[PDB]
Scaffold this motif. Structure first.
Motif, PDB file in Angstrom:
ATOM      1  N   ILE A  15       0.826  -1.197   0.000  1.00  0.00           N
ATOM      2  CA  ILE A  15       0.000   0.000   0.000  1.00  0.00           C
ATOM      3  C   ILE A  15       0.864   1.253   0.000  1.00  0.00           C
ATOM      4  O   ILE A  15       0.797   2.057  -0.934  1.00  0.00           O
ATOM      5  N   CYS A  16       1.684   1.434   1.029  1.00  0.00           N
ATOM      6  CA  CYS A  16       2.426   2.678   1.166  1.00  0.00           C
ATOM      7  C   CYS A  16       3.793   2.643   0.508  1.00  0.00           C
ATOM      8  O   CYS A  16       4.453   3.686   0.467  1.00  0.00           O
ATOM      9  N   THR A  17       4.211   1.486  -0.021  1.00  0.00           N
ATOM     10  CA  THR A  17       5.485   1.287  -0.735  1.00  0.00           C
ATOM     11  C   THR A  17       6.683   1.719   0.105  1.00  0.00           C
ATOM     12  O   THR A  17       7.587   2.405  -0.372  1.00  0.00           O
ATOM     13  N   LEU A  18       6.692   1.303   1.366  1.00  0.00           N
ATOM     14  CA  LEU A  18       7.667   1.747   2.329  1.00  0.00           C
ATOM     15  C   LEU A  18       8.012   0.517   3.160  1.00  0.00           C
ATOM     16  O   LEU A  18       7.119  -0.288   3.459  1.00  0.00           O
ATOM     17  N   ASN A  33      -0.484   8.126  -5.962  1.00  0.00           N
ATOM     18  CA  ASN A  33       0.749   8.896  -6.061  1.00  0.00           C
ATOM     19  C   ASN A  33       1.713   8.396  -5.004  1.00  0.00           C
ATOM     20  O   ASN A  33       1.323   8.229  -3.848  1.00  0.00           O
ATOM     21  N   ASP A  34       2.969   8.188  -5.401  1.00  0.00           N
ATOM     22  CA  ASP A  34       3.932   7.564  -4.505  1.00  0.00           C
ATOM     23  C   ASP A  34       4.328   8.484  -3.362  1.00  0.00           C
ATOM     24  O   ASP A  34       4.659   8.004  -2.278  1.00  0.00           O
ATOM     25  N   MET A  35       4.281   9.797  -3.566  1.00  0.00           N
ATOM     26  CA  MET A  35       4.522  10.698  -2.451  1.00  0.00           C
ATOM     27  C   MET A  35       3.303  10.841  -1.554  1.00  0.00           C
ATOM     28  O   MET A  35       3.444  11.276  -0.408  1.00  0.00           O
ATOM     29  N   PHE A  85       2.636   9.551   2.370  1.00  0.00           N
ATOM     30  CA  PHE A  85       2.092  10.581   3.247  1.00  0.00           C
ATOM     31  C   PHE A  85       0.898  10.061   4.032  1.00  0.00           C
ATOM     32  O   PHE A  85       0.760  10.341   5.227  1.00  0.00           O
ATOM     33  N   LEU A  86       0.030   9.297   3.375  1.00  0.00           N
ATOM     34  CA  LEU A  86      -1.227   8.879   3.976  1.00  0.00           C
ATOM     35  C   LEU A  86      -1.045   7.776   5.008  1.00  0.00           C
ATOM     36  O   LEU A  86      -1.952   7.542   5.809  1.00  0.00           O
ATOM     37  N   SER A  87       0.110   7.119   5.036  1.00  0.00           N
ATOM     38  CA  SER A  87       0.338   6.062   6.009  1.00  0.00           C
ATOM     39  C   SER A  87       0.904   6.573   7.321  1.00  0.00           C
ATOM     40  O   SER A  87       0.626   5.993   8.374  1.00  0.00           O
ATOM     41  N   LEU A  88       1.696   7.639   7.284  1.00  0.00           N
ATOM     42  CA  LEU A  88       2.357   8.145   8.478  1.00  0.00           C
ATOM     43  C   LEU A  88       1.429   8.901   9.416  1.00  0.00           C
ATOM     44  O   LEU A  88       1.862   9.276  10.509  1.00  0.00           O
ATOM     45  N   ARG A  95      15.029   6.565  -0.344  1.00  0.00           N
ATOM     46  CA  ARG A  95      13.852   7.268  -0.813  1.00  0.00           C
ATOM     47  C   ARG A  95      13.599   8.454   0.096  1.00  0.00           C
ATOM     48  O   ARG A  95      14.161   8.553   1.188  1.00  0.00           O
ATOM     49  N   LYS A  96      12.750   9.363  -0.363  1.00  0.00           N
ATOM     50  CA  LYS A  96      12.441  10.570   0.384  1.00  0.00           C
ATOM     51  C   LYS A  96      10.970  10.584   0.759  1.00  0.00           C
ATOM     52  O   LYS A  96      10.105  10.242  -0.051  1.00  0.00           O
ATOM     53  N   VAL A  97      10.700  10.930   2.016  1.00  0.00           N
ATOM     54  CA  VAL A  97       9.368  10.853   2.601  1.00  0.00           C
ATOM     55  C   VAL A  97       9.062  12.186   3.262  1.00  0.00           C
ATOM     56  O   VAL A  97       9.880  12.709   4.025  1.00  0.00           O
TER      57      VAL A  97
END
Ligand SMILES: O=P(O)(O)O[C@H]1[C@H](OP(=O)(O)O)[C@@H](OP(=O)(O)O)[C@H](OP(=O)(O)O)[C@@H](OP(=O)(O)O)[C@H]1OP(=O)(O)O
Ligand SMILES: [Mg+2]
Ligand SMILES: [Mg+2]
Ligand SMILES: [Mg+2]
Ligand SMILES: [Mg+2]
Ligand SMILES: [Zn+2]
Ligand SMILES: [Zn+2]
Ligand SMILES: [Zn+2]
Lengths: 261, 193, 292, 145, 50
Positions: free
Chosen positions: C34-37, C104-106, C110-113, E23-25
């Motif tokens: 989902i969050c690609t993190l 959108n990957d950014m 953003f939406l997971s944190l 990566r940048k967050v």
RNA sequence: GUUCGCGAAGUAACCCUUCGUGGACAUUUGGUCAAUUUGAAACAAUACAGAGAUGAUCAGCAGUUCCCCUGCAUAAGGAUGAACCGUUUUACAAAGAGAUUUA
């Protein structure tokens, strides 16, 4: 049973008869890390699959049947599995018994075991999304599939009805001539996932036709995941089934609170 | 595999570990194909290594006699600066090259007493130790050097690059601190708005 | 916090029936779907001798915001998918609840944190706020083309012949098929009627239904099955001219049949979508002429 | 792993690439264990990665120092005798193989051929009788308790 | 369920932490309670001297 | 398969062979991973442009950015690496006049 459990699965392709792992040359030097060609202009890079699945012929018992494998052999669907009866995965068209085994597992990954993704691929190709239980295939690229036969507008639909009926239970088949594409909806998602990799890069030639020696020169037909159906004749059917799905779940859900209390 | 993962398929790395471009290169390709000291230094070690191993292959195949073999290795270990060109990338190795030359002068004049000037002298042991001690020094170095290279391939560059002050950017950084200090003091003076 | 991390959220039915499970923790394993993190990939097997590794596909932050497990991504209570969960709460609160996801990957990262709950994850993970809505589900259960030249086609559709025992045919003509009633449901109703179940192995029957023309046909092999299909259908309707028609009986629907006495094929129903709609419009009168 | 064109080698390509930092250590263990001029062939004990990534020579070359000093001294005399009485000495050309040809495999080419005669001093059976049996072993007196 | 948690023996050549990229967050701000900016009131008369 | 027993048969004369039967020894591999098109490298080529102060011609060094690339790099270079060069309206009042309403 009589068609499937009676026999064992047979070796579709000999291991020497398998294609070469390097692709057809579209470049000047071959890249070793990324197994592709580098200094090249472009390429259509799509070709007709040399192999195909004869479903009532190639199906049979395999090693994964005795092992209790849940997942189907991806190559069996491409008509390419060289292991035959020694293969770890299943070699038959999915059935209601099989999909009932996959019921806990189908939510996040396909019938071939490959993990689904968050959103669809851009062209609606590939494996699929776990956010939508899509059961409808977009049959495209029919012109290169037929090797540019005119044939009819509607004899095209006959071949599509013939082939995809072997690959599982069908909800409906719709052909659109002005867009030159078909929409095949299955009873189960697992058959649609199975038929998608079965029918990618195939041809609809039917041997009796005169182009059967030049089935290989053509393009092959794209089978891609389908979008939503835009007419409100179908839209209202979606919320009707979504209603009926909701009523069948609430009865199952109040029994959980009955056991919870 | 490293060259081709970077996409540099136009650079041909032959079997004797020479790296040559296969075509005339555009400027965007020349910038991309610049390989660091850690890549080339790693290549020159293998070029030195294969040059030794090939002579043992030549001996085993029967092309080369054992006296020619021992002279061959002694020719290698003395002329690595000439044979390989390792120096260009780690110029400290000129200590080992001028040491192997100095041992070559000591060995020959005790060897060639009552003998003429000729090729064959195979006492490669003194020169052998110099390279092994040079290898000992560069094992911790290259493991740091390539270990940063490979992680840059897999993970990419960190986005948190903070430039230290240097002689070239001292005058600019002196101005940034000066405008900030004047900005802060005047803004306190200001009553409001 | 990299040294203080939550335990993973996994279902009971992913873990299965056995008591002790050896699970493998990889501290930065795969990245989240989902969050690609990246996250701690847990993976395990139900039994020791199993043959399927069950991985955690999403991180615990994406699993908490949706209130789902990491493995099968079904809801932790009620064990249903997220799309069906947010639809059932929509019928109770009478407003659309929905967890929306960025493309959108950014804006996946953003939406997971953020520490919010998404969709029906405020209703679920509160047991008091979930059981009362199940009670509110219970009260809902107390409620419980005139220009077309179609004349070339209607000569080939039978439309004037009777459903008797005496003709011995392979093919039949099914009309009055709704835009619902899927092609598999008509083959299963015929095969339940004959007991020729698992028909797709032997290919005993082949069925074509258009769903635009509201008409279809089903072909049999081995014509002796045709008298079994005639004799196993009891209810028929006689048009007030005559010409009795059998009724297939899908639940709440009625599908009329006449022996074709030839093979209809594809394209008998229509060769263009605009053309097929007028054949359903052609039939709707004959159904009303057959009944009334 | 000569031609990793298949998809199955995607992890093993990563193992080649991650082994590159350890390659420098592998050159040392190879060159320190190099056969000395009195040995035809040397059997070394190697440690390898299961994807064939890197092959460390997992030994250290131990020698007895008075034995080792004698062994070089014998070859030192043997090469001084050689250079004196050779009509012509042909130093081999470098690099020994052309760059276009691949390194030829050990087993199709090297392993079948008889090795050659290693450098040995001739010896005196009356003067050198205590050492003449074991002076040119790979590890001299290794099995003698 | 009692679940034993074990570590996998990592291959020393394959990259450990396969999901680790550079990566940048961008981070959201967690604002639950507003902080009152507690100045004092208002010596506020001023000519054009500034 | 080995070894310790026990039993039966035969050769034996308490040994050998045979097959019955207790023991003991040894005890749960591997996968985050399936073999070409549809789950993703990138270049090059074609067309169109064509290098920051400015009047012209030349050095740059920075800053900011949810852009990076090459590099062992916290060095340096990447056109001063590039992108910047646009859009632009209210914390708004106090005084002093002629038309138009209101009732
Ligand atoms: O050319 P020079 O400087 O006058 O000296 C040469 C040279 O040795 P150096 O370069 O170290 O001095 C030769 O070596 P190369 O230059 O060819 O590598 C060496 O012979 P090798 O080629 O075999 O090393 C030869 O000495 P010799 O022929 O005895 O080996 C020696 O001249 P000398 O006769 O004065 O030693
Ligand atoms: Mg710069
Ligand atoms: Mg300039
Ligand atoms: Mg410059
Ligand atoms: Mg700059
Ligand atoms: Zn298979
Ligand atoms: Zn996540
Ligand atoms: Zn689950």
């Amino acid at each position: 049973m009589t068609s499937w459990r009676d026999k064992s699965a047979k070796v579709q392709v000999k291991e020497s008869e398998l294609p070469s792992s390097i692709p057809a040359q579209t470049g000047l030097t071959f890249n070793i890390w990324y197994n592709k060609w580098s200094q090249g202009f472009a390429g259509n890079t799509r070709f007709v699959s040399p192999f195909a699945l004869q479903p009532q012929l190639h199906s049979g018992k395999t090693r994964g049947d005795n092992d209790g494998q849940l997942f189907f052999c991806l190559f069996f669907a491409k008509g390419m599995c060289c292991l035959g009866p020694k293969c770890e995965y299943l070699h038959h068209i999915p059935d209601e018994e099989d999909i009932g085994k996959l019921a806990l597992r189908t939510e996040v990954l396909d019938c071939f075991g490959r993990e689904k993704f968050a959103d669809y691929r851009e062209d609606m190709g590939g494996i699929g999304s776990f956010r939508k239980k899509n059961k409808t295939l977009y049959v495209g690229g029919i012109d290169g599939a037929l090797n540019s036969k005119h044939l009819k507008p509607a004899q095209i639909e006959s071949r599509i009805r013939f082939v995809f009926s072997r690959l599982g239970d069908i909800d409906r088949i719709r052909y659109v001539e002005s867009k030159n594409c078909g929409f095949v909806k299955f009873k189960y998602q697992a058959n649609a996932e199975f038929a998608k990799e079965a029918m990618s890069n195939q041809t609809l030639l039917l041997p009796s036709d005169k182009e059967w020696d030049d089935r290989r020169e053509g393009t092959g037909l794209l089978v891609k995941w389908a979008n939503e159906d835009p007419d409100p004749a179908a839209q209202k059917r979606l919320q009707e089934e979504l209603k009926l799905e909701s009523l069948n779940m609430m009865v199952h859900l109040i029994n959980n609170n009955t056991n919870s209390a | 595999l490293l060259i081709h993962r970077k996409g540099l398929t136009y650079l041909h790395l032959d079997y004797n570990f020479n790296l040559k471009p296969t075509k005339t290169l555009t400027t965007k390709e020349r910038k991309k194909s610049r390989l660091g000291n850690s890549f080339h230094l790693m290549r020159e070690l293998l070029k030195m290594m294969k040059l030794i191993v090939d002579t043992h292959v030549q001996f085993r195949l029967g092309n080369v006699d054992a006296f020619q073999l021992a002279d061959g290795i002694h020719y290698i270990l003395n002329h690595i600066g000439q044979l390989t060109g390792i120096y260009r990338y780690k110029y400290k190795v000129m200590h080992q090259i001028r040491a192997c030359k100095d041992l070559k002068h000591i060995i020959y004049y005790k060897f060639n007493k009552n003998l003429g000037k000729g090729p064959g002298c195979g006492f490669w042991q003194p020169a052998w130790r110099v390279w092994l001690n040079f290898l000992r020094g560069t094992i911790p170095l290259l493991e740091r050097y390539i270990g940063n290279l490979i992680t840059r391939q897999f993970e990419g560059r960190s986005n948190e690059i903070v430039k230290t002050t240097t002689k070239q950017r001292l005058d600019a950084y002196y101005d940034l601190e000066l405008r900030n200090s004047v900005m802060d003091d005047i803004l306190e003076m200001m009553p409001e708005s | 916090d990299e040294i203080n991390e939550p335990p993973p959220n996994i279902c009971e039915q992913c873990l299965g029936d056995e008591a002790n499970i050896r699970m493998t923790k990889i501290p930065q394993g795969s990245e989240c779907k989902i969050c690609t993190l990246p996250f701690t990939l847990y993976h395990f097997k139900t039994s020791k001798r199993s043959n399927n590794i069950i991985k955690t596909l999403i991180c615990v932050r994406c699993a908490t915001q949706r209130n789902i497990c990491q493995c099968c991504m079904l809801d932790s209570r009620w064990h249903i998918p997220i799309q069906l969960r947010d639809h059932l709460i929509s019928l109770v609160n009478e407003e659309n609840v929905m967890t929306e996801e960025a493309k959108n990957d950014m804006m996946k990262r953003f939406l997971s944190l953020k520490n919010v709950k998404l969709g029906g994850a405020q209703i679920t993970s509160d047991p008091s706020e979930a059981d009362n809505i199940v009670d509110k589900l219970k009260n809902i259960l107390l409620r419980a083309y005139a220009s077309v030249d179609i004349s070339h086609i209607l000569k080939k559709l039978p439309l004037n012949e009777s459903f008797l025992k005496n003709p011995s045919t392979k093919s039949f003509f099914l009309y009055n098929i709704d835009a619902s009633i899927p092609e598999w449901k008509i083959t299963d109703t015929v095969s339940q009627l004959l007991g020729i179940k698992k028909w797709k192995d032997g290919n005993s029957l082949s069925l074509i239904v258009n769903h635009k023309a509201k008409c279809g046909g089903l072909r049999f092999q081995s014509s002796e099955l045709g008298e079994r299909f005639v004799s196993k259908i009891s209810e028929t309707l006689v048009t007030p001219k005559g010409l009795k028609r059998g009724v297939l009986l899908i639940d709440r629907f009625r599908i009329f049949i006449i022996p074709w006495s030839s093979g209809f094929s594809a394209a008998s129903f229509g060769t263009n979508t605009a053309e097929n709609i007028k054949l359903s419009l052609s039939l709707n009168k004959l159904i009303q002429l057959e009944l009334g | 792993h000569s031609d990793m064109a298949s998809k199955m080698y995607n992890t093993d390509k990563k193992a080649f690439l991650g082994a590159l930092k350890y390659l420098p250590h592998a050159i040392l263990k190879l060159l320190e264990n190099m056969p000395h001029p009195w040995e035809q062939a040397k059997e070394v004990k190697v440690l390898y990665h299961t994807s064939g990534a890197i092959t460390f020579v997992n030994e250290t070359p131990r020698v007895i120092e008075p034995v080792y000093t004698a062994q070089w001294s014998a070859t030192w005399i043997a090469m001084r005798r050689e250079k004196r009485d050779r009509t012509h000495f042909k130093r081999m050309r470098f690099p020994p193989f052309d760059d276009d040809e691949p390194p030829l495999s050990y087993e199709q080419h090297i392993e079948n051929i008889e090795p050659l005669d290693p450098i040995n001093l001739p010896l005196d059976s009356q003067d050198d009788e205590y050492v003449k049996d074991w002076l040119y072993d790979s590890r001299p007196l290794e099995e003698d308790s | 369920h009692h679940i034993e948690v074990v570590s996998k023996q990592m291959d020393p050549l394959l990259p450990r932490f396969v999901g680790k990229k550079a990566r940048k967050v961008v981070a959201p701000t967690e604002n639950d309670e507003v902080v009152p900016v507690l100045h004092m009131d208002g010596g506020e008369a001023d000519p054009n001297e500034w």
